[PDB]
Amino acid sequence: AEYTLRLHHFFPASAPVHQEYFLPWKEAIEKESDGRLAVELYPSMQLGGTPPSLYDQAKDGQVDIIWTVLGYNSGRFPRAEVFDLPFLPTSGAATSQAAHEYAMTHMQDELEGVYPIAVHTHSPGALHTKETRIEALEDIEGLKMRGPSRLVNRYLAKLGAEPIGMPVAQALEALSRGVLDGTVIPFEAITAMGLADITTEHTIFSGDRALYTTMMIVAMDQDKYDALPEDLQPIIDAHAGGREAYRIGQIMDQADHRQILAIQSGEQPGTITRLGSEETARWQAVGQEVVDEWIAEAEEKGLDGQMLYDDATRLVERYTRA
Ligand SMILES: COc1cc(/C=C/C(=O)O)ccc1O
Numbered sequence: 407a408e409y410t411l412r413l414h415h416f417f418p419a420s421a422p423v424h425q426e427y428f429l430p431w432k433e434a435i436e437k438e439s440d441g442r443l444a445v446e447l448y449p450s451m452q453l454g455g456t457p458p459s460l461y462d463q464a465k466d467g468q469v470d471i472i473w474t475v476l477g478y479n480s481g482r483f484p485r486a487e488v489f490d491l492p493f494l495p496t497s498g499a500a501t502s503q504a505a506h507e508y509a510m511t512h513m514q515d516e517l518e519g520v521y522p523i524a525v526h527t528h529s530p531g532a533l534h535t536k537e538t539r540i541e542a543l544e545d546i547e548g549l550k551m552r553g554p555s556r557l558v559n560r561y562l563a564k565l566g567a568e569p570i571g572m573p574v575a576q577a578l579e580a581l582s583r584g585v586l587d588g589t590v591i592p593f594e595a596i597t598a599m600g601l602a603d604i605t606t607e608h609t610i611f612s613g614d615r616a617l618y619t620t621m622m623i624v625a626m627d628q629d630k631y632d633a634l635p636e637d638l639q640p641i642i643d644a645h646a647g648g649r650e651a652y653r654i655g656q657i658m659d660q661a662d663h664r665q666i667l668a669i670q671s672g673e674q675p676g677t678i679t680r681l682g683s684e685e686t687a688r689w690q691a692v693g694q695e696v697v698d699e700w701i702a703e704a705e706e707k708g709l710d711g712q713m714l715y716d717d718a719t720r721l722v723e724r725y726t727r728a
């Protein structure tokens with residue numbers, strides 16, 4: 407063992423991405439380097455600091471690898487915010503593929519200082535509340551709701567909710583404390599994060615697109631990568647890129663399915679409310695306003711909003727059809 411790679415994230419060890427991606431990734435790097443690389447996993451922010459501080463922990467070499475949400479740093483990753491727009495995503499797997507290709511095309515300057523192992527998204531975002539069953543747009547009116555990013559929080563406000571921004575690792579405390587009525591998140595880690603018995607009302611939508619997702623990165627310090635010897639850099643490259651994005655997305659999709667099945671079957675308490683095509687169209691109409699406003703503001707910013715939105719949408723459809 408010549409080099410140690412400390413990987414730091416904010417999820418519990420029992421989270422599916424830890425059990426089914428990071429542990430086998432560790433196994434692969436340690437086997438394929440013939441023990442010359444060790445990977446050490448640190449869940450639950452166990453090397454210190456705040457979820458939003460994680461990106462800089464890697465970029466600045468306090469740790470070697472982080473897993474984080476780009477939207478936790480408001481304004482930092484403007485081109486990545488395209489993947490926060492309403493009804494843009496499909497599956498974790500397909501949208502993660504689209505995110506990685508999109509980021510390799512458009513986000514080279516945005517990600518300078520990290521080697522991206524995977525640029526991906528989570529599985530379909532859904533609405534979770536403590537008490538209020540969301541059966542219509544009217545039911546979310548005045549609910550204190552948490553989203554991952556300023557653009558998802560903007561959609562929540564437009565839908566008539568009162569968004570309160572914070573990292574998801576802060577939601578359990580805030581719900582129990584009465585700050586939040588609910589949160590948007592995928593189902594995949596809802597059991598590992600212990601939210602399932604607190605937010606027991608869940609709402610999902612009709613049709614071939616999800617309410618929202620958000621862009622996530624497995625990012626290694628560009629200095630740690632660059633400092634590896636020429637025969638070990640390729641062990642990382644062989645366990646990096648679009649195929650890793652797909653793999654993370656697919657693990658989330660699979661964990662979502664197990665979790666949704668467990669609620670539908672009565673094995674775990676809670677209700678899944680499926681909004682039909684007519685009700686869903688009302689949410690998509692609000693969503694269209696967010697898309698239009700974001701493209702407009704991107705133009706005054708000096709970003710080509712329409713071009714990034716068209717390439718993101720094109721890539722989602724391509725990887726969904728495939
Ligand atoms: C607990 O659900 C999840 C949330 C996120 C995103 C972060 C956020 O919403 O702040 C990613 C994966 C999850 O399993």
Ligand SMILES: [Mg+2]
Nearest residue numbers: 465466627629
């Ligand atoms: Mg660095």
